[model samples]
Target chain A: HMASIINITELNISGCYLIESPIFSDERGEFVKTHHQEIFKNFGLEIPSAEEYYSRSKNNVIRGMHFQQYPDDHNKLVFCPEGEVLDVFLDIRKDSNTYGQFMSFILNPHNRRSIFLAKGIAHGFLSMKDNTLIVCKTSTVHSPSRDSGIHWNSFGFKWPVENPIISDKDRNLDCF
Target chain B: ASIINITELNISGCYLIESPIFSDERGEFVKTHHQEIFKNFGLEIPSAEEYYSRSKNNVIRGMHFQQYPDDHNKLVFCPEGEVLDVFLDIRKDSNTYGQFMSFILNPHNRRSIFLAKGIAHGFLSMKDNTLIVCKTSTVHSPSRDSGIHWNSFGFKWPVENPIISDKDRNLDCF
Candidate 1:
């Protein structure tokens, strides 16, 4: 996983993969190893449906392009390892067809990238700094209808922050 | 992986874990394993590969091993510095065939180590931006692979000249 992954220019907002991991620095702090099962077997992505979970946002907060309405639909693999994010993903699988198309990327632990969401997507992020950690790897398990989110300004996505600090339960989510 | 309705020292293919540090001061988050709590130590629920290595201030990689189509099983850690880690079991019939184990993981000491699968690991960088992270259950075969002589079964390093490799300063011993 060294971001030389120009091996796949597959991104139109559906099955994500900005994966380009390779940040082996020394003199101290820098080793970027965010779930690289052989670069997800060369982006054929699978075998990462569990064993990873961490979220610690702060900066401009604003979480959720979120989605998980049980029965099935949730497979993610994000990574920010320590600080900086701006993720954002949405496809809201209405039986597929790029429904509500959306995609974003910028998870920096110094540009060591990662993002692999496939399963009727709709993820979240926007912590640009301040303890910002965020490490997800879930296929599914923990859906007591927290109704994660959908109304970060009603999804026609756009928030480079100008006073964005959500969470009244994600600004009262609602809007498929 | 060892037994765990709880666990023990687990022997040769080493095993030492403390992991469970979720602290503050905006630092300290450890979750080296827990997918149903390691599913009760039954190796492989999902881990085909993951590797991290960086050594300085003396640099000395290992007494490595890997046999059969990338055979593996490891989970090491020494995040941020410290080393002396060493292990070797060369499982022939198990029961610690020449056992050895040592540890000193960091991140203010939230220890970790679990190596098993024809055991043979190594480390040396007692201090200097050294960082080691490993996770494997198969997937890494750059040869059927093998190594030993870093002073063979003596497990004491600090001795490197043209000795970090020719594949670990020319292997074979014990």
Candidate 2:
């Protein structure tokens, strides 16, 4: 059977996708199939990842509303393998209907869900628990000059946290 | 300046790679695989399928390899905790046949083992919550699953009594 084990659905924002992969658990432990090229090919999704990395955050930490400007802009496939996070994506494509709109999802090991963000979207997350780990694969390499973001509070979404521990760089981001 | 260092192992076709790990005020970042780096080494680009398993301390898995016609190469690494990864060559006509090599694969070392077809692989979890991720050249086939017994080979594992699955315990002797 030429099939995919991952379940993919388009989000409210155009070109963005929500992906759920299967987790086979047993008495020994757990086994997860996160990426399968052949399966991905069937879905017409090609995430040519140039870099793979992970960020671990403590509770109350809020990271991002981040993206790269054009010429270095990239697609991201992110998930949480441990603990949990409230993953948020903001559509920034000026010409699109979903522009300025945002959506949120809870990502953790239990749900086994990943978000595939299109090039024009901005992304960030709120750590719900301590040691929350977010792993990401990006289509482009890191370019400090191209790194950008909107203020976490600049968008309309109400964060669950009142005083989120954030970086000076993120706290100083310009509003959309 | 992030760079990848690849070292050839004793066994022909097997490689020990040190991937770049970047740390900043936010946290840490690691680039596990890069196409351009592999291409520069004159290696065939990997058309990969990824799989990961979380294991407990003292757990020993594999010595596993798929049979002929379904054999595939592998790039194995640990993102969390530690493992003593072992690779044994079993190709009958090769010079390194019956020889074994082992390495400490861990997130700290940021090292990975790349095995060519015909090498049987296995590992022992040195710490709890050991997470091993393998990127293989082919999709898994149940029928192709075959491996020698963990104790069948001459190499003596560090742990005398390891927690092994019944399926692995029932494997054929080398």
Candidate 3:
């Protein structure tokens, strides 16, 4: 029932679709769906070829801004299955007016919404709670040269808290 | 027997669910619902609520964020019409971070999802008439109401003369 607006066009991937379950009532209880295929194809999508990755973070931890490079430049779709996260997407497309434009969402059990990030956009998130699990899907395979990132402080994100827990790898990344 | 895959945040995975459509003389009947399926995703969605809104082309509803900490997650779709769904992550601790993400969602496209708390979310209507539906994890809170002005986000909305609700137009600029 709550909502927001964002700017992205042309999300094409076979395995990057998400399934939403609706509840139906009966005399006994309720029923829901775990996944659906026809519903996706009907929406103008093909089942994507995909690989999975998982990350767990403690409360107030940050990670991201990493995307593939050259041959492996990729697009992604992300969701938080357990715990909660404040997810971010920065449009790095050179020609977009909204280029440098960024948006965030809370991905948790409550709002089961999935976000689609096109190629050339940077993705990352901060774990709002301890033991948060973040999942993602990409358009291409992994390439170290393409694994890029930016510092969290350079962007003026105005995070709710300071001195957040971060990894040395993330802390050492370049600032945009 | 349906398998849909989702790729984002450096991971790729499948979402499988089934829909049963019923047919009859008058029209047709179909059913789609499963609790165990969502459970597999590790979502303990106990309570659910639905909200619907109608907007003409260029109509905008957004720059809205929840007040409480991490309490709401949302699933949004355009079952009857179409619009561009946008998400803004305001949580400052995030890494590859900045401000927002957006996607075009239409009735023709079935699955669009959104997670809540710590982010501001909104949408712009692209068609002459559009209906947007959303499901929330928690009940709405009035005191926790928060938002930013649409123009403040620097987005080039498709239409110049958009029909915006007075409530949306009145929000404070960031």
Better of 1 and 3 by TM-score: 3
lDDT tens digits by residue: candidate 3, B15-61: 22233333222122122222343455654322334444556677777
**What lDDT is reached at residue A102 by model 3?**
73
The interface root-mean-square deviation of each model, in the order shown, is 10.1, 2.4, 20.8
Off by over 4 Å in 1: A1-68, A73-77, A81-84, A88-107, A110-121, A124-136, A139-176, B1-43, B46-89, B92-118, B122-133, B136-174
Give DockQ per model, in order: 0.09, 0.55, 0.02
Residue A111 lDDT in model 1? 68
Provide TM-scores for the models.
0.31, 0.88, 0.43
lDDT of 1 by residue, B95-159 (tens): 87877776767656657677767878877776666667677777667787777766778665555
Q: Candidate 3, A172: how far from true, in Å? A: 1.7
- The residue ranges of model 3 lying beyond 4 angstroms of the native Cα positions read A1-48, B1-174
Give one digit per residue, the lDDT tens place, for model 2 in B1-174: 378877778898888888787764545567776666766665543445776788888999988998778788888878788999998899998899998999999888889888999999999999888888777777777799789888898988999678999989999988
Per-model RMSD to reference: 17.6, 2.8, 22.1
State the lDDT of candidate 3 residue by residue for A45-79, as single tens digits: 42222333345567888777666666677757555
Candidate 2 CAPRI classification by DockQ: medium
Docking class of 1: incorrect
lDDT of 2 at A155: 86
